[PDB]
Amino acid sequence: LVPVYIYSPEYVSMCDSLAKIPKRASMVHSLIEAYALHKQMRIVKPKVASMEEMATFHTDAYLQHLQKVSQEGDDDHPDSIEYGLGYDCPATEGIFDYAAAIGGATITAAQCLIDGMCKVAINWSGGWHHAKKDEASGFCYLNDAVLGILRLRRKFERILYVDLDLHHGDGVEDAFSFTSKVMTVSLHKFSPGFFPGTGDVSDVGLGKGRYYSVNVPIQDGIQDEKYYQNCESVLKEVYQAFNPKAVVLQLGADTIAGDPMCSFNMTPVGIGKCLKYILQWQLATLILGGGGFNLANTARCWTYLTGVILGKTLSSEIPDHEFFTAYGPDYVLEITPSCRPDRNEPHRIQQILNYIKGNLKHVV
């Protein structure tokens, strides 16, 4: 009944090599360790995803190109543009080994849930939800979330994917757009010009998977209370209609106040309440990270959320550790929202919610 914590020193070093989030994995782990939370969890060393395992979602053409430019570090390949490699997703040396490590880590967590070893499995270095079957996107080279869901499908008939990242979980949604075995729910910023540009409330999936995709478009400046009440109402309707047997939860911390993207205005407490509501279901739950570009804040958030999973109240004061100096000037766990308005009109929020309720009536 103790939650599983996917970790190994080699795995963290690997994830630290991401150009878009250097050293973030170490900061997250070190803070968790500093709070001694790892002693309350079962530490499981992740295995590397094999080519075949990765091929359960990604095409062989993409995987082979990815591996090819990875060994070379060739950032000037004429095929890379169509495969989504570029500014957002550079051809870093060893990028294939990196992506294979993250994919395997999420698969390992999923396998732990299948084997009944735990009810909660955690991979904070995962949650790369933008990657498509044949295209890298939004700092995501391999979609470990999809890989994890496909693994869970071996044991669980219906899987609910919840995406609380700042950005639309388009890669995961696209992967299961035509199926009713997996329902995707994404709460995200939706505004013209904002990546990835998709995920309106009118997007509900296709074919047999119609109405099995849920999108909650949100505007800038949303804070804990409005977000949670909006999240709870949606999740309540979703749970009733879909009746999931397993949950995959993406918890990208780029929604948190202090993030350089400066869009949402959340604190880890608000996200924590959404987490608590999901954990209340007592289902097999796979926890993933994702976005988060204020590194210290992301560590603050995921450490706090780890405490939520463990049902522990963490000390407000950041304990001394390797990256202690990065937590100035206040050196506390709590995060203060910024003093900017919430661009979300209450009538529009209720309007979106009613639209979703209308869609979920078709889910039987």
Binding site: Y87, D88, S137, G138, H167, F195, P196, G197
Partner: peptide
């Protein structure tokens, strides 16, 4: 295609 958007930039992230």
């Amino acid at each position: 295609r958007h930039k992230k």
